[PDB]
Design a protein around this ligand. Structure first.
Ligand SMILES: O=S(=O)(O)c1cc(O)ccc1O
Length: 130
């Protein structure tokens, strides 16, 4: 465990959970809302928590990412380590569909159904921060 940044290979954005529950990315490394905490619920699954607001990254039923005040089943992701030290993160509540956490090249969140293995959108490199 520990405070990580999750760097998105697609446009070079840190995954950001804004206080209003909005999920996007920024290039600004000083941003308060890119500090995350990963917690292994079981072996395969992780929660990804903002260490600024205590919000947990979540995916709703339409594949939209949001920050959730309190850890429901929408907040659990499977962390699979990949080819290049980059991880991907699959929704649990929708694993069967292969909904990934992803960001677009402009830093916008990419809704789960538009993700697909092999895309740069879905690849996040965990970086110990400070
Ligand atoms: O893998 S791709 O470079 O095709 C990609 C395109 C795109 O428009 C959004 C995310 C992506 O990973």
């Amino acid at each position: 465990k520990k405070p990580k940044l999750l760097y998105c290979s697609n446009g070079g954005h840190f995954l950001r959970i804004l206080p209003d529950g909005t999920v996007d990315g920024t290039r600004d490394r000083s941003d308060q809302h890119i500090q995350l905490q990963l917690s292994a619920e079981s072996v395969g699954e992780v929660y990804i928590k903002s260490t600024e607001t205590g919000q947990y990254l979540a995916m709703d039923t339409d594949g939209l990412l949001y920050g959730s005040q309190t850890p429901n089943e929408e907040c659990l992701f499977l962390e699979r380590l990949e080819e290049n030290h980059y991880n991907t993160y699959i929704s649990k509540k929708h694993a069967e569909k292969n909904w990934f956490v992803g960001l677009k090249k402009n830093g916008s969140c990419k809704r789960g159904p538009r993700t697909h293995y092999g895309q740069k959108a879905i690849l996040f490199l965990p970086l110990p921060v400070s």
